[PDB]
């Protein structure tokens, strides 16, 4: 998965999966991928 803001089953907490799920969790710190720039993803992480 590239990444999508999704609700988790418990406590209805927002989370990211895929690239930004790994990135916001500290597992990765930079992404080289065909990642489209949009409003939703730019709010939490920054794009060159």
């Amino acid at each position: 998965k590239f990444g999508t803001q999704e609700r988790v089953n418990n406590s209805n907490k927002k989370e990211w999966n895929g690239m930004m799920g790994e990135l916001l969790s500290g597992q990765a710190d930079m992404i080289v991928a065909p990642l489209t720039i949009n409003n939703e993803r730019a709010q939490y992480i920054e794009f060159s």
Binding site: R7, N12, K13, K14
Partner: protein, 508 residues
């Protein structure tokens, strides 16, 4: 093995010790490997010395392995008193009524004290559930230096940050002191028409509401949702409280004291059965409160991990790690025009059910300006103009370019009544209505028509659109309304915004 539980009440309630003992008489094998010898007691008044002496006497004499305390007064300190007693005696204590039912924040880690109540967090959760159900996304926040306000603001900020609903939080107000003197009016003056969440004490709530009314913050379009702490004692209502104050509280009407005690003893019995089926045997109580026994006093096995997963006969009364009900019994009440707390909604198994699908307008005060910009609007589902859909499974609210709209759907053909389900309406006519509301600056509560179909005069009585509008049940009829001679005679029509004649459809 026999398990001893003491039940302590006050003289305010009419329940006697014999009735308390008979409450443990179901006789369908409640505890498979164990039987309970419940002992009852009544106390004149609650205070530290008498309370500790009584609990120590019950522990030493009956060798009780548990205790359920039902308080009559509204003194909050008895909660911490019972918590301290539990910490010093390792006896599982349950809070039922009165001061034992009002919540303290952080329990001792080594104390087995559980309560029949909900934290400020659950109260805030049901506030936001009310707000989302009525689509009051825009709101403000005014608080005081009353303890627990930091936790409340942190929880609401976490919730708004982690919710897909828009939740347009305007501002946060924290009145330290000198409400009517200075440095407080300027903050209160910048809250616009929205929901104002107030968290303070009742005595401070009176002053806050007086200041708000003096500043004109208590209009028809102002809704205040407040916790049980400001509502407090139901029977007393200060004159400063305007009608329409939505509040959430632990139910004291339906959930009676006898049911309270039965539930508490059931939780204790279920925990005992669980520990028996898991561990070896019930640990005997402590030797005594006094004497300063030279021992770590920590039992090898305790019930603390066993009330987390408890299921009674019909209900699930499980507790959290810090000691809150997973499914607490919360009711949403409002101050009606009769100046009395009347229940509206209820919170069962993480689901909020409201009696009123649409929020009725409440006159805050006798001198309040009459509601004129709020109009009752009817509509009928038409394929190109009025499309009606269910609620969004994702956001649990009406999506963009849609408006709330209640449909009176019957349970079944057997009954002669139904409930109002809040669906979402969109389309050409709804878009026109949105533009009309934006321009003319009027508010609406759209609702589907269920009497007729597009209007018809039968037996000199109009149904549908014309019937609803003529009998003063609505202000305007927005929808696929064909302008007709009889309709124009009966009601007044606007300028036609689209040509709608009669035509023929045939197969090619």
């Amino acid at each position: 093995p026999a398990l001893n539980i003491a039940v302590l009440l006050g003289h305010s309630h009419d329940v006697t010790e014999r009735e308390l003992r008979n409450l443990w008489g179901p006789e369908q094998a409640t505890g498979l490997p164990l039987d309970v010898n419940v002992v009852a007691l009544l106390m004149n008044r609650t205070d530290p010395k008498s309370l500790i002496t009584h609990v120590c006497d019950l522990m030493s004499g009956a060798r009780i392995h548990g205790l359920v305390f039902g308080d009559d007064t509204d003194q909050e300190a008895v909660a911490q008193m019972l918590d301290f007693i539990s910490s010093q005696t390792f006896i599982p204590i349950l809070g039922i009524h009165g001061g034992a039912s009002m919540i303290m924040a952080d329990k001792d880690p080594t104390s087995t004290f559980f309560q029949f109540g909900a934290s400020i967090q659950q109260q805030a959760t049901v506030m936001l559930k009310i707000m989302q159900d009525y689509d009051w996304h825009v709101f403000s926040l005014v608080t005081t230096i009353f303890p627990g306000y930091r936790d409340f603001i942190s929880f609401i900020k976490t919730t708004v940050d982690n919710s897909f609903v828009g939740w347009d939080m305007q501002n946060v107000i924290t009145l330290d002191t000198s409400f009517e003197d200075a440095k407080t009016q300027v903050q209160l003056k910048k809250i616009h028409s929205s929901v104002i969440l107030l968290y303070c004490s009742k005595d401070e709530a009176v002053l806050i509401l007086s200041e708000a009314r003096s500043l004109g913050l208590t209009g028809y379009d102002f809704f205040w949702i407040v916790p049980s702490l400001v509502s407090g004692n139901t029977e007393l209502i200060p004159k400063e409280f305007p009608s329409g104050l939505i509040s959430v509280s632990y139910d004291d009407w339906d959930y009676s004291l006898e049911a309270r005690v039965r539930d508490g003893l059931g939780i204790l019995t279920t925990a005992a059965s669980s520990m028996l089926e898991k561990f070896s045997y019930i640990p005997e109580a402590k030797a005594s409160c006094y004497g300063q026994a030279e021992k770590p006093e920590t039992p090898l096995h305790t019930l603390h991990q066993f009330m987390v997963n408890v299921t009674w006969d019909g209900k699930d009364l499980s507790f959290t790690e810090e000691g809150y009900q997973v499914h607490p019994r919360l009711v949403v009440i409002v101050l009606n025009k009769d100046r009395e707390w009347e229940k509206v909604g209820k919170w069962e198994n993480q689901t909020l059910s409201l009696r009123h699908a649409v929020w009725p307008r409440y006159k805050s005060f006798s001198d309040c300006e009459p509601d004129d910009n709020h109009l009752s609007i009817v509509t009928l589902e038409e394929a190109p103009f009025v499309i009606v859909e269910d609620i969004d499974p994702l956001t649990e609210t009406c999506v963009r370019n849609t408006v709330p709209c209640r449909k009176f759907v019957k349970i079944n053909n057997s009954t002669n009544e139904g409930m109002n389900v809040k669906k979402c309406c969109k389309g050409f006519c709804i878009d026109i209505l949105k533009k009309l509301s934006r321009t003319v600056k009027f508010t609406y509560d759209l609702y589907l028509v269920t009497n007729g179909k597009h209007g018809k005069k039968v037996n000199n009585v109009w149904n549908g659109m014309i019937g609803e509008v003529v009998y003063q049940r609505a202000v305007m009829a927005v929808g696929s309304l064909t302008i007709n001679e009889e309709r124009s005679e009966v009601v007044d029509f606007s300028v036609p915004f689209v040509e709608t004649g009669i035509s023929v459809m045939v197969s090619r």
